[PDB]
């Protein structure tokens, strides 16, 4: 009958990188999504299946909350059936997605004069991720036929790449914090609703 922490997933001080997106499991809840929808601060609030009005009056076994920070123009790639950097190599959603995607600008918190390089993203990979797959390996990427043994140089690049966050960037270039909710149903008494 207690309120589980939507504050520790939305108002957390520091967010994880996109290639290492944070996942939290939410169970045994009474949940009021009305304040979430009426916050009037999210630049993007969209989801698929359940109507954005009927989340509270429907019961789920448990929820998964993923959080990360990406570029603004890349927020479009967080959707089922997408392609690109994030949708292929970093964070991929299944076609039959159910949860809701929320995204808001965080320029005042994640951007500094000179360049904020703490956030990384994967750039080179042999294949595409399966849905909900996380890869944090930092093995060297071999593009050519030369079997380089962990040396960065000719035809061998470090897969992870940093991005510079400036206060002078365009609105589509500025950092955006993204939270994705996924409700799942199994042979469970559906403890999460209210």
């Amino acid at each position: 009958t207690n309120l589980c922490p939507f504050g520790e997933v939305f108002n957390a001080t520091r967010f994880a990188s996109v290639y290492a997106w944070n996942r939290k499991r939410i169970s045994n809840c009474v949940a009021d999504y009305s304040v979430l929808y009426n916050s009037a601060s999210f630049s993007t609030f969209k989801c698929y299946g359940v109507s954005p009005t009927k989340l509270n009056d429907l019961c789920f076994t448990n929820v998964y909350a993923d959080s990360f920070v990406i570029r603004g123009d890349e927020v479009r790639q967080i959707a089922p059936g997408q392609t690109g950097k994030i949708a292929d190599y970093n964070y991929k959603l299944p076609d039959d997605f159910t949860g809701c995607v929320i995204a808001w600008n965080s320029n005042n918190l994640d951007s500094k004069v000179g360049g904020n390089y703490n956030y990384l993203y994967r750039l080179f990979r042999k294949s595409n991720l399966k849905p909900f797959e996380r890869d944090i390996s930092t093995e060297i990427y071999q593009a050519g036929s030369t079997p380089c043994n962990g040396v960065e140089g000719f035809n061998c690049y470090f897969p992870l790449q940093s991005y510079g966050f400036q206060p002078t960037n365009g609105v589509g270039y500025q950092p955006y914090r993204v939270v994705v909710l996924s409700f799942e149903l199994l042979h469970a008494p559906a403890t999460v609703c209210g």
Epitope: T13, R14, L109, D110, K112, V113, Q166, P167, T168
Partner: antibody, heavy 127, light 106 residues
Framework: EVQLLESGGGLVQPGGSLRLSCAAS????????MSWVRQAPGKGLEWVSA????????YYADSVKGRFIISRDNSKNTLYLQMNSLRAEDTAVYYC????????????????????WGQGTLVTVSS | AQMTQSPSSVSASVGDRVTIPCRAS??????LAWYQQKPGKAPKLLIY???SLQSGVPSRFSGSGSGTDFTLTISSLQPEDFATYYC????????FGQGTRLEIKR
């Protein structure tokens, strides 16, 4: 009403120690970065030091690295400035100040405007 | 090391429309604050994000500018507006410097 009440200022000899205090009220203290600013007679304001809401990241002015420590008790809604090895030129009025925006985690990361300001204590380093 | 530059003094009479120019280091973008100080007293946030009027501040104060050239303008100077004004880059705590003294013309 946000308020910031300063105490602990006074007269100390070169080399001494002083502890400043900035009691905070009217807001969720632990969510805001805070800073110490000072003004020596006949000079302009300078940031002494600053600290994010959690206390986990702090900044010091070059002239005071190694000699001052900033800290907070979020339980008591109080900010501190432990001052050691004071020098004559540390003589000033010390203000404490609150960050307009909430939620910084790193003291060099984000935008830092200071809406509320304490009244200031005078610190005198002299023999 | 200071990040912003405004003239040492501007001279004006009550009623006047006063502007204070400010040149910032490149790469500040939006993050420019204006602060007012009366002598001996704590400074007061007037404008933030280069053009946003801070809560409780009289509407005659307004801030404009893009890039590296910013400017504070006081439409209708009141006698209590004579003070020192600082333009301050709102990241990595630059020093205040001499600011701009707003004094009475004569």
């Amino acid at each position: 009403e946000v308020q910031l009440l300063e105490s602990g200022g006074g007269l100390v000899q070169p080399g001494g120690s002083l502890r400043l205090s900035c009691a905070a009220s009217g807001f969720t203290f632990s969510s805001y970065a805070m800073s110490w600013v000072r003004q020596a007679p006949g000079k302009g304001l300078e940031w002494v030091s600053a600290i994010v809401g959690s206390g986990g990241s702090t900044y010091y002015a070059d002239s005071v690295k190694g000699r001052f420590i900033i800290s907070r008790d979020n339980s008591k809604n109080t900010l501190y400035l432990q001052m050691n090895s004071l020098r004559a030129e540390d003589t000033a009025v010390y203000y404490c100040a609150k960050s307009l925006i909430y939620g910084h985690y790193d003291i060099l990361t984000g935008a830092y405007y200071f809406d509320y300001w304490g009244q200031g204590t005078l610190v005198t380093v002299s023999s | 090391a200071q990040m912003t530059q405004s003239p040492s003094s501007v001279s004006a009479s009550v009623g006047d429309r006063v502007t204070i120019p400010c040149r910032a280091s490149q790469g500040i973008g939006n993050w420019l604050a204006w602060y007012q100080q009366k002598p001996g007293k704590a400074p007061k946030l007037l404008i933030y994000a280069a053009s946003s009027l801070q809560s409780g501040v009289p509407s005659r104060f307004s801030g404009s500018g893009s890039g590296t050239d910013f400017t504070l303008t006081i439409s209708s100077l009141q006698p209590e507006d004579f003070a020192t004004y600082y333009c301050q880059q709102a990241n990595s705590f630059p020093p205040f410097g001499q600011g701009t003294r707003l004094e009475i013309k004569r």
